[PDB]
Each structure stands twice: as structure tokens, then as C-alpha cells.
Amino acid sequence: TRITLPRRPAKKIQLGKSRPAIYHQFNVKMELSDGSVVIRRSQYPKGEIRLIQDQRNNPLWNPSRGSLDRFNKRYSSLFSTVELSEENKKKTQ
Amino acid sequence: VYCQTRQDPIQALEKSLDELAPLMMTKTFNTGVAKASVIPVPLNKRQRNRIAWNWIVQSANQRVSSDFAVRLGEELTAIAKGTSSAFEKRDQIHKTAIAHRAYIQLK
Amino acid sequence: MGNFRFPIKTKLPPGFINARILRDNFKRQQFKENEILVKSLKFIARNMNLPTKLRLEAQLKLNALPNYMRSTQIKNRCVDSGHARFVLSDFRLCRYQFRENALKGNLPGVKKGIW
Amino acid sequence: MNVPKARLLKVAELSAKIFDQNFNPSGIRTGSKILNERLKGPSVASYYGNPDILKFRHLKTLYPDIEFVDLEEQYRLSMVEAKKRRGKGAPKKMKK
Amino acid sequence: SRSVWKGPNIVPLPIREAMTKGTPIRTNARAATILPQFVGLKFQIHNGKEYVPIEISEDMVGHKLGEFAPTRKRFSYTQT
RNA sequence: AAACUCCAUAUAUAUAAUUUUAAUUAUAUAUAAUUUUAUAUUAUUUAAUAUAAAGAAAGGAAUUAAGACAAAUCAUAAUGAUCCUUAUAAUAUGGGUAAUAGACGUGCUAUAAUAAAAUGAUAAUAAAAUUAUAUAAAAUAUAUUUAAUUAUAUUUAAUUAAUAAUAUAAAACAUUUUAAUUUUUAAUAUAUUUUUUUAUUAUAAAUAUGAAUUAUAAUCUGAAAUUCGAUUAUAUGAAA
Ligand SMILES: [Mg+2]
Ligand SMILES: [Mg+2]
Ligand SMILES: [Mg+2]
Ligand SMILES: [Mg+2]
Ligand SMILES: [Mg+2]
Ligand SMILES: [Mg+2]
Ligand SMILES: [Mg+2]
Ligand SMILES: [Mg+2]
Ligand SMILES: [Mg+2]
Ligand SMILES: [Mg+2]
Ligand SMILES: [Mg+2]
Ligand SMILES: [Mg+2]
Ligand SMILES: [Mg+2]
Ligand SMILES: [Mg+2]
Ligand SMILES: [Mg+2]
Ligand SMILES: [Mg+2]
Ligand SMILES: [Mg+2]
Incomplete structure (x- = not known):
């Protein structure tokens, strides 16, 4: 019933001979939303990443400073504010 | 058929039908709620040739080609030359008719 | 209101009156009244050439038009009875009712289909 | 279509101008x-009939001399009277 | 209006007041196309019986309001 | 019951200036048959079989009695009794009638070669019926480099009709193709099977069947297509 990987005999690490797990890590450049680059060590092999949604473009982190897209595309000739004002009578609710 | 064996094809077919068509059939009956006593019954010309044709068709359907017309023609030529399981079936029918000699009513 | 079912005082049709019939008739009258206007509004709406704001306004107006302005809302009732199934247009009658009339001789010519 | 397109278009436009039809x-x-x-x-609108048709009401207006009888109405009245008599009349309507 | 030309299916609503002050819009339309002008407005779309509260995300922009208020109850069988 | 009746048939007459033409027609009025006659062969003057000569002469529809089934209908409609009368009567907005475990009828499409698909413009061959709450021709545009096909859009020519349109009927028939199928292909030669033959090499249980199911894009009707409509395209390609 319980899904498992059944253990083999464990390998005896002798006292003193235990070595620390130094994983393989690359120096990875993260360019944030704006052009601020930051180096971070990372295990996945990718020298450069550029981020779209970060703290540097989120309103919470700087208060002082594709269905919708599809809709925009195929109702473009009409150009859809003035339109809101036209189609917003607040009597019926 | 004609191309394979150069002699009137219609006549040859008619001959084949005559050969193959079993002259009588052991028709089954209920027989007043008892043993189903079979009787030899004579056949109309059409019935005789109808029996023959179905067998001919069956034997043609065992031949190779895509076109049925070709298969049919090959079968007809074979029958003209003198080789079929249809003949064997006819013989068997005749043997079965021969058993039940006096089961015929009017005699 | 109290004095009438619908907004506008329309006449009752002659002969067989029914609630459904009454409802239909009124609707038909309102359609007849406001046919040209509706057409004009539709035209204004479905126009690539005209200003978009105007077409939007026309569309809104069309949307806001009542139940009784709609052509699609009209349903051919039987006139003798008040049924709305198998209503033949050539004599505004229901199936059974038509047959009854036909056999009597009310539809002048209609007669048994003998071939 | 060996004949040129532009010429055909021009011809069609001319025809449209001649008649009222648009191009x-x-x-x-x-x-x-x-x-x-x-x-x-x-x-x-003309589906159900001509609403101005003569009725029994009018048959009193046109011919006062002849004391007509609407039979169905009379029957209905008699039924109503019978209902009233045997305690099966309509209950009095609420106004509020 | 489905066809790309002549669309979308626009209906009158109390939109601007909802935008100013978070008052949900009780729609009995169900055939009004959602627009970009109301994403993040609270709608209360009719279900036949009871009005259904929905907050319109940016994924809903193409669809009708009635598509998010499911009218029939989820079918089951009484295993007797 | 049969017969008179209608449709259809054959013939005759009438009418149609044979551009509303289809006279090879349409429609009024007749006549015509529930066919007749004779020679024979069986059974008793007749009746069935056969043969012959005379004829266009052969069908379908409507009509389904009395009684019964307390058969069906108070949801075509009406009426008796009974019940409701601020509600069981009346109007609007939305939803439902299209819900889905199993089951039951009717159909449709299928499971490929006596059977499916492409194509066929001096356009192979019909009938019946509809078009003032309309029928929509030609032609242009897009899907689509030619164009045709099919589908939409553009715009209404003609006719409210033996005159125009719906509408070049379709199977048929003919060439081509067709996996399963190394029962084929293509490289060489080969030749009096040349849209083909032979030789030697390589070509290793749902398809080039079916069209359910779904994804996206468009179009149509309508004021409105989410529940819940119809097309077209590009994919998807269950079961059988
Ligand atoms: Mg009779
Ligand atoms: Mg002629
Ligand atoms: Mg009877
Ligand atoms: Mg009963
Ligand atoms: Mg009964
Ligand atoms: Mg009653
Ligand atoms: Mg009633
Ligand atoms: Mg009520
Ligand atoms: Mg139903
Ligand atoms: Mg049935
Ligand atoms: Mg097939
Ligand atoms: Mg055309
Ligand atoms: Mg014509
Ligand atoms: Mg053709
Ligand atoms: Mg299978
Ligand atoms: Mg297929
Ligand atoms: Mg197919």
C-alpha cells in the first residue's frame, strides 16, 4: 500500500573521514525588472537570467515610485474613459 | 472466360449451371409435430440455377483479385474445365436425396 | 398598472380572445409602431463607416428597448383557438382547428387530399 | 478574363451612377x-383581425327598436345566479 | 454580438460607482461580455435562483458573465 | 360491401395568333372495361386451366359499419360539477424544459475494392412545389496564385410567376486513385503486353477506413448565442 524505495545496506562513513557536501554551483547573473544586475550562486546551469516580475517593479516594494491581450487584438478597429462614461448608467442595479 | 478458353461463354456458363444445379433438394418439414421427416422435392429451373450461382460466387470469392468480375470469370473458367467444391456439394446433396427414397408422398 | 396589463392601451382582437393571444397581439402592435426606429438603430449600430461612439449609443438603445419592441418575440398563434403549435400561415389556424374548419367548408376551397 | 479589371470597374461604377443602385x-x-x-x-399587426368589428353592444346603439338577446351572456348570467343561490358564488374581492 | 465586427456584447451597468467605491454589481445580464474596463470589480451575477459573487480577473476578459454562474446543480444518483 | 369519387392511363373535341410554349404541353368536356370473343381439355347448361385475336387497357388514393376497449384527449376548443379570487388570476428580468448512474425504444453515420474518393462547361437525363411577413440571378472580394469547386461578404438583375429565381438534379456512365497487400514502389537492364512485361537489387489487426471527442480562429441569424443555435477553416482522429 505504502509506496517506497527499499533501502540497500548503508555505506559506513568512518569517523574523521566524513566530508562536507559542497554541491556544484555556478555564478548566475540575475537582471531584475530594471537593469540592476545581481550575482547569485545557483545549482542550475544558467549563467544569465532576466526577471519580469520582481520587487523592483511591484507596487508594494516601491509605493512612492493573455485573454485581455487577445481581446485588445480582435477589438482593435473599434478602439473600445469616454467609452466607460457612455456605457455606465447607474440607475439600474 | 472466353479469352481463357475460346468458345461461346454464355453456352459454357449454361452448361456449368446444368451440371452444378442439384435436380432435387431434401426439404425439411415439421411433419405434424413429430420427427422432422425430410422429403426430396423437385426444383424449378431458376431455383436449380440459383443454388448453382451462390456456390459459384462463394468459390469466386476465394480467388485473389480486387475486382469481383475477374474472380467470377476465373471461377467460371475453372468450372468449364472441370474443378470445384460446388460439384462435391451437389454430389453430397444428391446422395442425401437418394437416402429418403420413398419419403416422397405421391410417389 | 391596474387598469391595463401592458403600458399602452391597445384594442382587443375580434372573435376568440385569450391571455396569450392578448399578449402576442399587443407585442405585434408595438413592433408595428416602432419598426422603422428599431431598423434605424440597428443600421447605426452595424456601421464600420460611422463614428464608434454613436454606434455604441445606438447599440445601448437597442439593448434597452422593451420586450414588446422585439420582432423575434412575435409568435404566430391560432386565431380560432389560441394554440401555438403547428400553426399554418395560409389560414392562421392550429392543426386540429384547421382540419375542423376545412371539413366544414370555412376555408372556401380547401378540401380532402385524395390524389 | 483577358479584358482588364480597371475598365470593368469603371463600367460598373458608370452603370451604378445611371441607375440608383450603389457602387x-x-x-x-x-x-x-x-x-x-x-x-x-x-x-x-393585422394578424388577429379588424378590432373595430360589430359586437352585440352596438347587434342597442344602431337599432334601439329591436330588443335583441345575446344567448351566451344570458346563460352566463343564469349560471352566476344559480351559483349565488347555492352558496357557490364568487368571494368578494379585496381592495386594500 | 459574437462576430468580431459589431462586437462586443455591451450592456448598461452601474460600473463607475463600483469603480469609485467597492459596491458589487448585481447583474441579471448573463450575456454581457466582460471588458478590460471591469477587471477587479465585484460582480454578483444571477444564477436563476441566487446571485453569485465573482471578482473578475484578467483571464475572464473575453468571456460572458453567465459563463461563471452555473445554473444547474451538480448531478448525482441516489444508489438505492 | 360493391359502385358512383379523386389520381394516373388511352382516345376524341374544344382553347393556346406555338414569344408566359412545355403542343413531346395544359385544362375543360366527353367516351373507354368490375374487359370481350372463340377453340380445346378436366369436371359437372356452366366453371377452372391452356391456346388464340381484339384491345392503351395495368395500378394507387379516399371511404375503415354496428358494437366494444369507462382505449386516448378537460394542454386545440368548449361545457357540467367542484376548488382558487392580493391569488391556483396578470406583467417583467433571469433560469429551466437541453440536468445524467443504469435501462428502453425509434433513427443517422459507420466498420473500404460485386466500393469509397478527385474530376467530367457546346454543362447526360427528372418530377413535384415555393417565392409582397419574399425567391435572390449574374458579377466582384476574402478563405486560396492561377481558376474551378465549397463557404461567407459585397449588391440586388429578374418575378410576385406556365413568363424570373430557388435549381447546370443525383446516382448513372468514363478516366484517375485507393491501405490492409513484397497483390506495390524505383535503380538498373530487358522487349513484338511499352498508361506494360521479365530479370536482379532495395522496399519490414483501425488505414490514404470512420468521423465521435476536444483546442483555436473566423462567419450567420437575432436586440441577445453563457447555460443553449447553425456554418467554414486549421488542428484533434474514440469506438467500430
Ligand atoms: Mg366502396
Ligand atoms: Mg411547343
Ligand atoms: Mg365501428
Ligand atoms: Mg378511462
Ligand atoms: Mg373513454
Ligand atoms: Mg372542464
Ligand atoms: Mg380553456
Ligand atoms: Mg397568475
Ligand atoms: Mg422533450
Ligand atoms: Mg414513430
Ligand atoms: Mg468506403
Ligand atoms: Mg451567383
Ligand atoms: Mg425560370
Ligand atoms: Mg451537371
Ligand atoms: Mg478497434
Ligand atoms: Mg476520413
Ligand atoms: Mg466519408
Whole structure:
């Protein structure tokens, strides 16, 4: 019933001979939303990443400073504010 | 058929039908709620040739080609030359008719 | 209101009156009244050439038009009875009712289909 | 179609000018089919009949001399009277 | 209006007041196309019986309001 | 019951200035048959079989009695009794009638070669019926480099009709193709099977069947297509 990987005999690490797990890590450049680059060590092999949604473009982190897209595309000739004002009578609710 | 064996094809077919068509059939009956006593019954010309044709068709359907017309023609030529399981079936029918000699009513 | 079912005082049709019939008739009258206007509004709406704001306004107006302005809302009732199934247009009658009339001789010519 | 296109278009435009019919070479939705449709309203309105038809009420107006009897109405009245008599009349309507 | 030309299916609503002050819009339309002008407005769309509260995300922009208020109850069988 | 009746048939007459033409027609009025006659062969003057000569002469529809089934209908409609009368009567907005475990009828499409698909413009061959709450021709544009086909859009020519349109009927028939099928292909030669033959090499249980199911894009009707409509395209390609 319980899904498992059944253990083999464990390998005896002798006292003193235990070595620390130094994983393989690359120096990875993260360019944030704006052009601020930051180096971070990372295990996945990718020298450069550029981020779209970060703290540097989120309103919470700087208060002082594709269905919708599809809709925009195929109702473009009409150009859809003035339109809101036209189609917003607040009597019926 | 004609191309394979150069002699009137219609006549040859008619001959084949005559050969193959079993002259009588052991028709089954209920027989007043008892043993189903079979009787030899004579056949109309059409019935005789109808029996023959179905067998001919069956034997043609065992031949190779895509076109049925070709298969049919090959079968007809074979029958003209003198080789079929249809003949064997006819013989068997005749043997079965021969058993039940006096089961015929009017005699 | 109290004095009438619908907004506008329309006449009752002659002969067989029914609630459904009454409802239909009124609707038909309102359609007849406001046919040209509706057409004009539709035209204004479905126009690539005209200003978009105007077409939007026309569309809104069309949307806001009542139940009784709609052509699609009209349903051919039987006139003798008040049924709305198998209503033949050539004599505004229901199936059974038509047959009854036909056999009597009310539809002048209609007669048994003998071939 | 060996004959040129532009010439044919010009001819078509000329023909359109001659008659009243419009000339739409681009093939854009003009809205012509909305208006040009014959309006069917009066015929639709005339479905149930002529509402001004003579009734029993009028048969008193036209011929006061003849004391007519509407039979169905009289029957209905008699039924109502019978209902009243045997305690099966309509309950009095609420006003509020 | 489905066809790309002549769309979308626009209906009158109390939109601007909802935008100013968070008052949900009780729609009995169900055939009004959602627009970009109301994403993040609270709608209360009719279900036949009871009005259904929905907050319109940016994924809903193409669809009708009635598509998010499911009218029939989820079918089951009484295993007797 | 049969017969008179209608449709259809054959013939005759009438009418149609044979551009509303289809006279090879349409429609009024007749006549015509529930066919007749004779020679024979069986059974008793007749009746069935056969043969012959005379004829266009052969069908379908409507009509389904009395009684019964307390058969069906108070949801075509009406009426008796009974019940409701601020509600069981009346109007609007939305939803439902299209819900889905199993089951039951009717159909449709299928499971490929006596059977499916492409194509066929001096356009192979019909009938019946509809078009003032309309029928929509030609032609242009897009899907689509030619164009045709099919589908939409553009715009209404003609006719409210033996005159124009719906509408070049379709199977048929003919060439081509067709996996399962190394029962084929293509490289060489080969030749009096040349849209083909032979030789030697390589070509290793749902398809080039079916069209359910779904994704996206468009179009149509309508004021409105989410529940819940119809097309077209590009994919998807269950079961059988
Ligand atoms: Mg009779
Ligand atoms: Mg002629
Ligand atoms: Mg009877
Ligand atoms: Mg009963
Ligand atoms: Mg009964
Ligand atoms: Mg009653
Ligand atoms: Mg009633
Ligand atoms: Mg009520
Ligand atoms: Mg139903
Ligand atoms: Mg049935
Ligand atoms: Mg097939
Ligand atoms: Mg055309
Ligand atoms: Mg014509
Ligand atoms: Mg053709
Ligand atoms: Mg299978
Ligand atoms: Mg297929
Ligand atoms: Mg197919």
C-alpha cells in the first residue's frame, strides 16, 4: 500500500573521514525588472537570467515610485474613459 | 472466360449451371409435430440455377483479385474445365436425396 | 398598472380572445409602431463607416428597448383557438382547428387530399 | 478574363451612377441590407383581425327598436345566479 | 454580438460607482461580455435562483458573465 | 360491401395568333372495361386451366359499419360539477424544459475494392412545389496564385410567376486513385503486353477506413448565442 524505495545496506562513513557536501554551483547573473544586475550562486546551469516580475517593479516594494491581450487584438478597429462614461448608467442595479 | 478458353461463354456458363444445379433438394418439414421427416422435392429451373450461382460466387470469392468480375470469370473458367467444391456439394446433396427414397408422398 | 396589463392601451382582437393571444397581439402592435426606429438603430449600430461612439449609443438603445419592441418575440398563434403549435400561415389556424374548419367548408376551397 | 479589371470597374461604377443602385468596389459592410429590407409591421399587426368589428353592444346603439338577446351572456348570467343561490358564488374581492 | 465586427456584447451597468467605491454589481445580464474596463470589480451575477459573487480577473476578459454562474446543480444518483 | 369519387392511363373535341410554349404541353368536356370473343381439355347448361385475336387497357388514393376497449384527449376548443379570487388570476428580468448512474425504444453515420474518393462547361437525363411577413440571378472580394469547386461578404438583375429565381438534379456512365497487400514502389537492364512485361537489387489487426471527442480562429441569424443555435477553416482522429 505504502509506496517506497527499499533501502540497500548503508555505506559506513568512518569517523574523521566524513566530508562536507559542497554541491556544484555556478555564478548566475540575475537582471531584475530594471537593469540592476545581481550575482547569485545557483545549482542550475544558467549563467544569465532576466526577471519580469520582481520587487523592483511591484507596487508594494516601491509605493512612492493573455485573454485581455487577445481581446485588445480582435477589438482593435473599434478602439473600445469616454467609452466607460457612455456605457455606465447607474440607475439600474 | 472466353479469352481463357475460346468458345461461346454464355453456352459454357449454361452448361456449368446444368451440371452444378442439384435436380432435387431434401426439404425439411415439421411433419405434424413429430420427427422432422425430410422429403426430396423437385426444383424449378431458376431455383436449380440459383443454388448453382451462390456456390459459384462463394468459390469466386476465394480467388485473389480486387475486382469481383475477374474472380467470377476465373471461377467460371475453372468450372468449364472441370474443378470445384460446388460439384462435391451437389454430389453430397444428391446422395442425401437418394437416402429418403420413398419419403416422397405421391410417389 | 391596474387598469391595463401592458403600458399602452391597445384594442382587443375580434372573435376568440385569450391571455396569450392578448399578449402576442399587443407585442405585434408595438413592433408595428416602432419598426422603422428599431431598423434605424440597428443600421447605426452595424456601421464600420460611422463614428464608434454613436454606434455604441445606438447599440445601448437597442439593448434597452422593451420586450414588446422585439420582432423575434412575435409568435404566430391560432386565431380560432389560441394554440401555438403547428400553426399554418395560409389560414392562421392550429392543426386540429384547421382540419375542423376545412371539413366544414370555412376555408372556401380547401378540401380532402385524395390524389 | 483577358479584358482588364480597371475598365470593368469603371463600367460598373458608370452603370451604378445611371441607375440608383450603389457602387461598392472594396466590398465593405455598408449596412445597406438593414435599411433596404422592406418593413413588415402593418401585415404583422393585422394578424388577429379588424378590432373595430360589430359586437352585440352596438347587434342597442344602431337599432334601439329591436330588443335583441345575446344567448351566451344570458346563460352566463343564469349560471352566476344559480351559483349565488347555492352558496357557490364568487368571494368578494379585496381592495386594500 | 459574437462576430468580431459589431462586437462586443455591451450592456448598461452601474460600473463607475463600483469603480469609485467597492459596491458589487448585481447583474441579471448573463450575456454581457466582460471588458478590460471591469477587471477587479465585484460582480454578483444571477444564477436563476441566487446571485453569485465573482471578482473578475484578467483571464475572464473575453468571456460572458453567465459563463461563471452555473445554473444547474451538480448531478448525482441516489444508489438505492 | 360493391359502385358512383379523386389520381394516373388511352382516345376524341374544344382553347393556346406555338414569344408566359412545355403542343413531346395544359385544362375543360366527353367516351373507354368490375374487359370481350372463340377453340380445346378436366369436371359437372356452366366453371377452372391452356391456346388464340381484339384491345392503351395495368395500378394507387379516399371511404375503415354496428358494437366494444369507462382505449386516448378537460394542454386545440368548449361545457357540467367542484376548488382558487392580493391569488391556483396578470406583467417583467433571469433560469429551466437541453440536468445524467443504469435501462428502453425509434433513427443517422459507420466498420473500404460485386466500393469509397478527385474530376467530367457546346454543362447526360427528372418530377413535384415555393417565392409582397419574399425567391435572390449574374458579377466582384476574402478563405486560396492561377481558376474551378465549397463557404461567407459585397449588391440586388429578374418575378410576385406556365413568363424570373430557388435549381447546370443525383446516382448513372468514363478516366484517375485507393491501405490492409513484397497483390506495390524505383535503380538498373530487358522487349513484338511499352498508361506494360521479365530479370536482379532495395522496399519490414483501425488505414490514404470512420468521423465521435476536444483546442483555436473566423462567419450567420437575432436586440441577445453563457447555460443553449447553425456554418467554414486549421488542428484533434474514440469506438467500430
Ligand atoms: Mg366502396
Ligand atoms: Mg411547343
Ligand atoms: Mg365501428
Ligand atoms: Mg378511462
Ligand atoms: Mg373513454
Ligand atoms: Mg372542464
Ligand atoms: Mg380553456
Ligand atoms: Mg397568475
Ligand atoms: Mg422533450
Ligand atoms: Mg414513430
Ligand atoms: Mg468506403
Ligand atoms: Mg451567383
Ligand atoms: Mg425560370
Ligand atoms: Mg451537371
Ligand atoms: Mg478497434
Ligand atoms: Mg476520413
Ligand atoms: Mg466519408
